[model samples]
Target chain A: STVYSAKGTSLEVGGRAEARLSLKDGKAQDNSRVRLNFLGKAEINDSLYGVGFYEGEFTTNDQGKNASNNSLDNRYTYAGIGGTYGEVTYGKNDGALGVITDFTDIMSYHGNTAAEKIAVADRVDNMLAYKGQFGDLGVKASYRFADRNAVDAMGNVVTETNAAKYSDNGEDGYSLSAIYTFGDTGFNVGAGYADQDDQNEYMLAASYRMENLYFAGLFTDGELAKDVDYTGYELAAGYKLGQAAFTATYNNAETAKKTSADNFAIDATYYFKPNFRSYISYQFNLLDSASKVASEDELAIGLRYDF
Target chain B: STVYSAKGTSLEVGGRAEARLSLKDGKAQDNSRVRLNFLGKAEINDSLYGVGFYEGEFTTNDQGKNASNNSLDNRYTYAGIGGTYGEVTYGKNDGALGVITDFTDIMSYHGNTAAEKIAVADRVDNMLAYKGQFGDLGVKASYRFADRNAVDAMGNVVTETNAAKYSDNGEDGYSLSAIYTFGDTGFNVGAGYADQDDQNEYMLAASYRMENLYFAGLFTDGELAKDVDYTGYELAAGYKLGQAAFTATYNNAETAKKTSADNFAIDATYYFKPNFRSYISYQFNLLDSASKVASEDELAIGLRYDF
Candidate 1:
């Protein structure tokens, strides 16, 4: 890490690399990923300032046939102004909805697959967001602009001609969420509402921690896709013992037509150091829907070093 | 923040944020952008070394609908080795054309627009470049690899199926430029050539600085697009007065058919602090042709704080 300071302005930059080997149902695969981030702040005045954050990742994978060996992936990047009142940011980042809907996002990978299943937007590209904290309460709100153009799987902008014939899947959206923590109680609760063009979602989440154990729950009710209204729920529990921890998460989603899907994951992690960890996880999925879509199961064992 | 260091090796990561409010034809817009960069160098011996740099940006724009909110907009990324002879880099970065054609790229927004108008290759995605300086003279040469495939507007590779029917607009290219400075004379001159596919361009630029006044001139003759042979020129001047500076630039381009375009920009800036600045600029464009495209004019006032 490097820090640069001049006058009242400062910047810190860093990055991380994660490598994993996994078995999907039975096929084994290995991959490595890296991410770099920049965090900076400048004092504009006594109580006003500017801040910027950027994170980007690249992965070594076999997904692209003729594509470049290394593919760029964006995590989150934003610029904002902040003071005692909190921050107001513009750019691409996790909006309010992502904040409230991430109760079970603690795991390396298996923990947040349900968020995608529920179709909650993870990040908004053209977003304006405000975040504030008062005592033990935190509030976030965001609006995503609608004028954005469409991109292909490769992250390229679709041409005007191609766009004229392709139906856009994104639209204007807004989200509001709030979380409150009980001082010294190790408990927190959060709720949020998200509205997209033709769909809307509502989420509720809560978490509690004991001396050695932690528990969290999340529930969502809304239209996850066009013509698909569903209710989803997730339960997660974790126990810590010395340098090792064991965690389990279960998620279920059911549509109005009685089609349902379930996912269960169990993981054990051992920390060789605060920034070095090794973990093994097993995930199983069950589908009882009428559509006959394939379900996925995986067993992953990996080691990661964060720097 | 994390730091990685070893024997004679060091890496630093950082980024920048540039936010602006702009009005186009009387419409107001606010945008924030952030770019993260990686800089690393390793000493091979007393004088030999290795270097790497990667910078990418994300903007507050609706250009990526299906893509990640923080898509990577590569500025320059490359890895190279250097010694007494010079340095050689391989990856994506500004080619020799950019090095030789940046005589008037000093403005906040409007200065380098002419480089685009004259179709100067700002950066090559797959490039190998070399740089060396001998006393007051400098040399640069680069070659962009060919056989690259098409990517979407967001820099994502298009699918083979989609690319089959879409003729790519980008091509492999090469450039070579050299600069010579008159020692103690406050004058420098540069010339370069860039060739991509069937299109080729040559540029000549010179600059003189005396006291608080500086002047630059650039000339280019080339083919910007298919069947569009053109000649272009630009003149720029700047004057510094205490903490304030004023600058003006003018550009003109004429095509084989005698069709012409002209651009004029004037700007005044005040530095409240070294890292803080406020500026107002006026830019106008004229097209003396029958292309039926609307010309552009803007008066922009903005504040920028850099850390």
Candidate 2:
């Protein structure tokens, strides 16, 4: 991250780029992307401040297409005020439940599939969120207002009878989450709950960190669709020795009728620079055809840079 | 603009916001938008460098719609290497023709309709551009490569028979421009030419700037559509008095079939702060009903902030 400060205002910019290749995909195995964000803050007083940010990503590969300008996908956008009491933000943001599930999604390559498969949503639209931390305890809460520009499956903006103001199904919802850290133990635990669009999710998470070691796990109970209940869990462990690091993860998720993600992955990476790294990972797809149909063990190699 | 530099790398962020209201529109007449850009520069040596930028805008007002995340539209994206000789950039960027047309299309509210109507395009995709300055002379040139992701009129990516590659009309073209500044006299003149898809354009422009006064004018000859020729001119003048500025402009164009944009506009703007401004503008519709279907006169007020 880079920052500039003047008077009572501060502005910041940072970004990352990733280039990857997958061995299993025959057509196009590489996925490259660029992401950037801008943040601005102004002090209302020593005790209060206003802030806003817009973050997005663009796929770098036109991939045999006619795209001269890659479309940007919104990662997050929000603005609000903060003070001793806490902070409040409204707009596209990580769902409140992320406060807890984030503990287990520690790896960059693949760690959150189980939660996503079981509909433990990560980001939502038109969200009004509040977050505060007291000592070692952190709390995150959010309310999703009705979405006005909900697009249909084909990416067409849903309009009222072509002139209507129809809101999406279950347009209102709320989420709550909390976490606590145990200082000397190097451990943290969290819990979260969210309900929206007639669906609900519950999560529990825990993590441990040491000078050269890390471990995290999370469990999620949720609905993938209307009346389709599901459950999932993710576990990750990693260790670093000088500039070399190794990590492993296991993810399992199941729906009422099928196994969504049953896989285990292991990877080793080399940090050539503080902000640049390259690594390879292999994932064993443990599910068979009988368990909702699945095939293919996967291998991927990628390089990433953050600034 | 804000900048941060360390270890030979520099990152910058800046943005603007605008809130506007149109008096003639009955429906929600206010259109609010936000824009931001990120720039990065790396020094290979004292005289050589690499630079890149991505800029875009998003509507702020969902405006009674279900948009939780406003769509972002690309304005420009380019990366290049530069030295004392010149700079070369490739990506979505201002068309090379802009080098000269930019002279007269100077106002913030409604200034280049005639040029746009005459197909004097401002931005194009898959473009390679070069710019350099030598004392008082500046040169700008560019070539457009075939666009791979050309979308159709409805904005859908144009695809070929589900298995083909089709480029857009006028996918290949080139433009050349040169401008010369006349020292402290505050005068600059430029000329440009462009050819693509069987269409051609010619432009000549001049501008003058004084401590408190400004003047600019331009003439363009081009084709609006294949076979449809046009000639137009734009004139603008402005005076700034302390924090207050007043400006006036006239635009005229006619196609082989009808008059395109014969209009005049006047605006008065006040700067509340160095970077914050509010203003009002009125545009007169000089074309009659017989002139390719006319438009109503326009009156608008807006507030803008740049950082």
Candidate 3:
């Protein structure tokens, strides 16, 4: 139901509308989200090509906010060239870390939640990345420049002192990943690290998949700042049959030592058609004994349509 | 890997990136904006068909602003059908009034500023329209539904009082236009009217085109409220030579009884290619007696790429 090509150029236009009805600790709530992607490719020559993509979205709460309603939100945008050397792009996009941790994003909900918990390590601004495939092996890497102003406690730019170890809060970050696949089975492993003010962090992850079954695990440990240390781990599994799929995941995270929590989530999805699906998910959380946060439980049912 | 046509449907993706450098009161500024259009068509049968278009844009300032940036700003979005009965569409689009006053939108800028000044009388939300052609004549008409909630001074819904006369800002507006072409020459005339709160407005416009020359004129009058009357007039001309074109326009607007202003704008554009153009324009404004607004002048140079 869309337009395709013209004059050596190809275009794809698509998006999804997802509506959710949920219960948070017995309180009912409802919300919906929408996203759109505009993708294009043009043949500059027989061997060289130009590619571009821009994705926009409207968040769950934008409908009633006059100024914010239907406001443009960019999820990804970049222009690049591609050929036999693989593809290299510069713009705002999922950083190398996102690519490295990609295997965990397998469910309708309760998938990878690193960006919200770790921040500055997911889809990054001002990024440059390269992705290539060699037979059964695939490799990808990305580098993000520090923001113009990565200020310290004294309000001085970190680059003003040590260039190699500037605060990563808004500083440079990088990640790398490699994957090998044989038949219907695949394996992936990756790592990433960053420096933030006086703190430094790193993460390692590995995943395996075969046919209708999948599994992934990750470990992350970091120094948020002086005297603040955090660590987290996630394990996830998914199985599919016919037009239905089931997924489960567990995450144990500790921030600032005393601020710790554990989350367990499970979901099932039924595909009514290639472009439409419905899912139900449940999540349970446990706060650390020493923490004042309350244990919580949530359940959600969602329907999505793609076009 | 991506969504495409189903059955006899087709999709097209295209848009333009426009950049402008402008000087206002001797202060110069530069910015760029991009628009993407996703158009689709399907053959339901031999004599009937379906069509759709979704266009969005990102302003120059969207890059730096996270939440406000990259938001989907809809330029045109609609789903419709066309056959021997002409065409009918439902969505957000230029109302019938815009069809009638469309002649003044000839210059790079400064023409057809009425919608901005008059409000809600131009491109309308929640619109249903019909367009048809017979022999050498073309006709168009549209109806805009009143907003779900039209509030009164006391903050009560106006529909609760006068259900038929309630004003939804500028909702419930309508317009009609007829165009007649004689051989290679073209001529058009149209009229439009709208009701807002206690205000009533109407406009009349006509245009003619032959070979490389075009001319248009418009008149609009309205009562904003008790004792508040406004009227405006515009004249525009365009001439083309080879790949270069020149345009000029004059606008005189009055508000209340003594408030009035006049604007003169001129521009020249060169077509670098069928899909690329560069233009320069200048505008001058003069305020009349009883108006406290400052007289202003502006000049701008812009480049646009359409794909």
Candidate 4:
């Protein structure tokens, strides 16, 4: 979830909801889903205001032994508050880098379903994030306290661990980003660092958009104890062709301790009337280090109506 | 997701999200959850306007083959648009009956978590919904236009089915509903019917609210095949005492060609503030044809903050 402030004492708030079902087997699947977000803004006065946003989603899953148990995990929630003093929020929310990555990655914006080009620090639950804007340029920074998760012999969840002093999810995390637009040229860049106590990550991304065509790229460097370092990158481009727009993205990932993989996706959308349209897309993944491959390529065609 | 238009032709859009995760080793367990909602409203010419909203969320899950696979259940996307002139919306939305059922459940608004007491109709995805207001009366409707899922003889995904006519999803369905309110008393009644050649459904619900007390009742009768008739009913009530409130609800469900079940739940909540509060609830399924026990109960403690 996020928030923003602009010039004037006026205020505005917003958000959305979405869900998808695989429709597997015969009857409707029980895995129903819903996503929601709520944002609020207040103009403190002319030239200054207060903006903040909190958003997330939750799905109902009663697939097994624990179906009888009622717990909070069945829902994902977020909220943040911001003003001229910067921004701080609790619950589950993203960091500055994740937000910046979304702004720069066309594929990420299309829906991360098939395009895993960008990496999300995921939500640092029970954390805080902050962003600040400068004239003609926007700068954002964020920090997340630390939390804990139990790991088994193979490092899988086995029990609950102690969370950091003020943190409740991850060990610790921070992010920073900048975006600037000059005339018809726009540029965005960002960096982030996070430590899970036992693991750490550092990432950088940059993009430039001009006229009807745009180019973007990103990089992630990560390390895990008893594991090797990981390096990943993506390069993509998009072209606006009158009533239709197209995007092509390619990504390569390398891990010191695990197999490396490469993925790509091509998608296009046609707008019949801005609010009415249809779309079709395809995605593929290849893992060269291992002989593992998915059962089949991914393909989908769908129609949408807007109000 | 939902959209509304009030006086001044003002258009308001809204979306919702929920996420849940459950972990267990034969009873001893833990979970985490979250939910979000964002709404937008625009006024035009003091008598007309436009509205749109976007919502996204991600959650953890433990129903997959393993934790990593379960982690894949994370959801993180949503987008929608709608306005006056009978708004039509896309991008993962619930059917009209589902919306009506939720609204007609009084204890739901009163903070109760007895699934047995509400008997929510099933939720559908990939739908086009419409809504409008005629003075004190309001009307809302939607259609999925296709079967959500199809199964083969042995219960596996059919090669290709459930696409809308002239579209990839098949011709599967549609629905409509209306509600009216005046002064301190509000009345809402709605019906929905959906058919997939052989499968059909019909649902009805009505509710009344006044001052600090409210009541709601619902009825649902449908068939999966010519021989199998399913029926359900729920009665719920709510009362408020200053900053504290109480809710009680009950439900009965039966499969005419086979078995029947009964469920009950009670919940309470206290406000620390109008937008922030804590809640507790208990639910049980008695005389179950299924197995958990002769009866089972749950206790929950949580907080919610609305903007």
Question: Which candidate has the top score in lDDT?
Answer: 2
- Tens-place lDDT digits, model 4, residues B100-177: 567435442222222221111243344455667778666766655344343344445543432211112344456565
lDDT of 2 by residue, B1-307 (tens): 4354554355565676454555432222334456787688777888898998888887543332223443778888889999989988888877656767677665667677766521224577678888899999998888877656655555566555453444455468788888999988999998888877767888888999989999999998977568888898899998999988898889998888678788899999886555556688888878775422145567776656554
For model 4, state the Cα shift of residue A142 in Å. Answer: 3.4
Q: Return the lDDT, model 1, position A253.
A: 74
* Candidate 1 lDDT for residue B186: 89
Q: Which stretches in model 4 have alpha-carbon errors above 4 Å?
A: A1-11, A19-36, A41-52, A58-93, A108-130, A133-139, A147-170, A176-196, A270-279, A288-295, A300-307, B1-10, B13-123, B126-307
Winner on lDDT (1 vs 3)? 1
Local accuracy of candidate 3 as per-residue lDDT tens digits, A260-299: 6577889999999988999999877765454343666778
- Model 4 TM-score, all chains together: 0.49
* Interface RMSD for candidate 4 relative to the native interface: 11.7
Off by over 4 Å in 1: A1-16, A19-33, A43-46, A62-68, A106-109, A113-121, A148-170, A225-227, A282-299, B5-101, B115-229, B235-248, B258-260, B264-285, B288-307
Interface RMSD of each: 6.1, 8.2, 11.4, 11.7
- Tens-place lDDT per residue, model 1, A1-307, is 3333333356665677787888875777876678776676667678877766667777765664655564666566566777899987766666776776567766655765545422224565656778899999999888765442434445566763333222233566787889999999999999988777767888899999989899999888888568878787889898999999899998877776564768889999999998889898888877654343357678888888776
Give model 3's docking category.
Answer: incorrect
Q: Runs in model 2 with CA error above 4 Å?
A: A1-10, A25-28, A61-69, A117-121, A149-169, A290-293, B1-13, B17-33, B37-55, B59-70, B74-307
Candidate 2: C-alpha lDDT: 0.71
DockQ, candidate 1, vs. native dimer: 0.21
Model 1 per-residue lDDT tens digits across residues B153-173: 565678866553433445667
Whole-model lDDT values for every prediction:
0.71, 0.71, 0.67, 0.51
Candidate 4 residue-wise lDDT, A106-172, digit = tens: 7412333321221225555656666666665666655666555656555555534432222134457
1 versus 2: better lDDT goes to:
2
Q: TM-score ranking from best to worst?
A: 1, 2, 3, 4
